[PDB]
Amino acid sequence: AWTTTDFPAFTEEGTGRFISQKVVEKGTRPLQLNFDQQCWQPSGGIKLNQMLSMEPCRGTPPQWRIFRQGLYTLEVDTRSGTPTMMISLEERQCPKWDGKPLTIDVSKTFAEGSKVRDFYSGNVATVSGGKITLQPAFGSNGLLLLERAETAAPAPFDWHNATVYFVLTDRFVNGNPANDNSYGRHKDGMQEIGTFHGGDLQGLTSKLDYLQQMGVNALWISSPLEQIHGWVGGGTKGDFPHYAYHGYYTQDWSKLDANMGTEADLRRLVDEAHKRGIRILFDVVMNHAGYATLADMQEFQFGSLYLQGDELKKTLGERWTDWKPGAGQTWHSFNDYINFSDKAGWEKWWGKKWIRIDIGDYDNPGYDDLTMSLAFLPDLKTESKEISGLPNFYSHKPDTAAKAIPGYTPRDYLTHWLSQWVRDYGIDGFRVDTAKHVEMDAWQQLKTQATAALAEWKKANPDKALDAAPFWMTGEAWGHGVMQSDYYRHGFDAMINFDYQDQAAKAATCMANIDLTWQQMADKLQSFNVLSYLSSHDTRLFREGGATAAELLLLAPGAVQIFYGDESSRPFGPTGSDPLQGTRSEMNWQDVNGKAARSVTHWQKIGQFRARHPAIGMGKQTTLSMSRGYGFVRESGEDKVMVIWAGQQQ
Numbered sequence: 001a002w003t004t005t006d007f008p009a010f011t012e013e014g015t016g017r018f019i020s021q022k023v024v025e026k027g028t029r030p031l032q033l034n035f036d037q038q039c040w041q042p043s044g045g046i047k048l049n050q051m052l053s054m055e056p057c058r059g060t061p062p063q064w065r066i067f068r069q070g071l072y073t074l075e076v077d078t079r080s081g082t083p084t085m086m087i088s089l090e091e092r093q094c095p096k097w098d099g100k101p102l103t104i105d106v107s108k109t110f111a112e113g114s115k116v117r118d119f120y121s122g123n124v125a126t127v128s129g130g131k132i133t134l135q136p137a138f139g140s141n142g143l144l145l146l147e148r149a150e151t152a153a154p155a156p157f158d159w160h161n162a163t164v165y166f167v168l169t170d171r172f173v174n175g176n177p178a179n180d181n182s183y184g185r186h187k188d189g190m191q192e193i194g195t196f197h198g199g200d201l202q203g204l205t206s207k208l209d210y211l212q213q214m215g216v217n218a219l220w221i222s223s224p225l226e227q228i229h230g231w232v233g234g235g236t237k238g239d240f241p242h243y244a245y246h247g248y249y250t251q252d253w254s255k256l257d258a259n260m261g262t263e264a265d266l267r268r269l270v271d272e273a274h275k276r277g278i279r280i281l282f283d284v285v286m287n288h289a290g291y292a293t294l295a296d297m298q299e300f301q302f303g304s305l306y307l308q309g310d311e312l313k314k315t316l317g318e319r320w321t322d323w324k325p326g327a328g329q330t331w332h333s334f335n336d337y338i339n340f341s342d343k344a345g346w347e348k349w350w351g352k353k354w355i356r357i358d359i360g361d362y363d364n365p366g367y368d369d370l371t372m373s374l375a376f377l378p379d380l381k382t383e384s385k386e387i388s389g390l391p392n393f394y395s396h397k398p399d400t401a402a403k404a405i406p407g408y409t410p411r412d413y414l415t416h417w418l419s420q421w422v423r424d425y426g427i428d429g430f431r432v433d434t435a436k437h438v439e440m441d442a443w444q445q446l447k448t449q450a451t452a453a454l455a456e457w458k459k460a461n462p463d464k465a466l467d468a469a470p471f472w473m474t475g476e477a478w479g480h481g482v483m484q485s486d487y488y489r490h491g492f493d494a495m496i497n498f499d500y501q502d503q504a505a506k507a508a509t510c511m512a513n514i515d516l517t518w519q520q521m522a523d524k525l526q527s528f529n530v531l532s533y534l535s536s537h538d539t540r541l542f543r544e545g546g547a548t549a550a551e552l553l554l555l556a557p558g559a560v561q562i563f564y565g566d567e568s569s570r571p572f573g574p575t576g577s578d579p580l581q582g583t584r585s586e587m588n589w590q591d592v593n594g595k596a597a598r599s600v601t602h603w604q605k606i607g608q609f610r611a612r613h614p615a616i617g618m619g620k621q622t623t624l625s626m627s628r629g630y631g632f633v634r635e636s637g638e639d640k641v642m643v644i645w646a647g648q649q650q
């Protein structure tokens with residue numbers, strides 16, 4: 001019932017939002033939205049990709065200026081009470097689409113006389129002569145998501161149909177600003193490339209409904225465990241202070257990092273998530289501890305400085321971590337104050353039984369994946385059989401839950417420390433970092449202990465547990481593809497798939513180009529699982545897919561990983577002299593309620609569809625042969641879907 005001249009009637013794309021699309025030639029035209037006899041118009045000028053205020057129609061209608069030809073989207077939002085609206089433009093051996101309805105042969109898929117729903121539109125059609133006719137809705141990108149109209153709700157969770165949301169908690173939602181500066185951490189007052197922005201568990205807990213609406217059923221959070229308190233030089237040029245905002249620079253595995261919140265905050269995160277049918281994954285590290293920082297050296301009384309006497313307080317200050325680089329220095333310059341050769345000083349850190357590192361009197365790193373010091377990080381001796389006792393510097397850390405345990409090796413402590421979280425909070429699985437730099441046996445020990453820990457909790461908490469499924473574990477082995485490697489026989493249920501990113505890239509301008517990849521994956525993954533992604537914190541943000549990134553990821557066989565902000569085209573941020581930093585940019589919440597709202601809606605719909613159909617993640621694929629457009633069927637057990645893509649609208 002929303003309309004404007006020379007554009008189709010608006011359809012609802014999300015509650016309270018209505019949109020319309022058309023290919024429009026260059027030129028100028030008036031702009032009024034009508035809803036019956038209500039007439040509205042832009043009151044504050046006309047720009048693209050901005051929330052336009054609107055007034056009741058008076059005088060001459062505002063003149064909208066069409067600079068470039070293309071498919072435009074008009075949106076109107078009634079959620080605020082008064083109508084706002086928005087305009088946006090979507091700037092070959094590829095199937096073309098005239099824009100008009102499609103007639104699909106469904107004779108081998110859906111029963112004669114039955115009802116078939118296109119989930120995206122909600123339109124339902126009765127199979128007659130083995131055929132249905134349907135118009136792809138606005139925002140579909142020409143998709144039909146065909147299911148039996150009987151389909152009503154989400155299907156039972158399966159890890160092979162999982163929609164995993166991977167979030168860097170610090171960069172998501174700041175629920176409580178009070179804990180932003182734990183252990184004397186500061187903002188840099190520059191571009192905050194490597195600082196703690198202040199995102200926390202409380203904040204994340206506040207967005208569980210939003211995640212639930214996307215059809216997310218697994219939440220992978222950055223490690224919430226206590227990190228190094230200080231910072232190191234950021235990037236190749238030391239143009240920013242690098243803090244452990246990502247969770248990969250752990251110091252105490254036994255405690256939560258104060259930036260993240262309290263024990264109660266975690267309990268609420270996990271319990272609320274479970275209530276919504278969302279599983280929880282901790283990012284975990286056993287390869288390395290965090291770098292030595294001034295904050296930690298001072299606090300826990302380890303390491304060695306070249307500065308002696310009055311020179312120490314006058315250069316580094318009362319709190320050494322408050323040091324900032326002066327003229328002619330970088331954030332790497334502080335290293336010149338540190339004496340990394342002093343044996344006694346640096347033994348007071350982790351200690352010779354715990355880590356490998358080219359410092360002091362430590363065991364030197366090896367020249368292979370397993371024993372090397374990855375980017376100069378202290379390499380934990382997971383393969384050691386030596387009884388170690390606690391790390392030396394823990395003697396000056398009275399707030400630790402870590403107790404010395406008779407007979408324990410460094411590995412035994414680590415697996416105990418991680419499993420305790422599983423035991424206490426009912427963490428459903430892990431994502432394992434740096435998988436190829438730790439021996440397979442260690443991962444097996446982690447899995448065994450974690451499996452036991454989860455089973456113990458579910459038995460203790462029968463009210464809370466969703467099912468009796470076993471602990472799950474995925475891993476990052478660098479460059480891993482769609483292959484059932486030996487990781488699968490040392491405790492990994494799935495490995496992260498590095499190859500999907502490039503395949504999706506080749507289908508960014510033409511969705512149908514993914515067909516061969518999807519066929520191969522659907523077949524290969526009949527006997528195992530992988531976790532595929534478009535975007536990651538150590539590759540890039542995938543933004544070349546126009547509006548089609550949702551379907552490219554979410555219709556993939558196997559488990560899939562949404563990197564926070566994929567749904568809202570979160571932009572690459574300031575990155576300085578480390579090319580990876582921009583991928584950890586702040587979540588663009590302002591865009592989520594504004595210019596990215598229809599994108600978010602698009603992801604919600606395609607994700608909700610996947611959640612209803614295990615055949616997407618698990619089923620065997622048959623690619624349809626048609627004269628127009630592209631289409632396939634997938635089938636797993638009683639579940640069956642048909643996906644049709646009309647093709648390019650221009």
Ligand SMILES: [Ca+2]
Nearest residue numbers: 176177198200
């Ligand atoms: Ca905070």
Ligand SMILES: [Ca+2]
Nearest residue numbers: 370371379437
């Ligand atoms: Ca190692």
Ligand SMILES: [Tb+3]
Nearest residue numbers: 368369370436
């Ligand atoms: Tb190796």
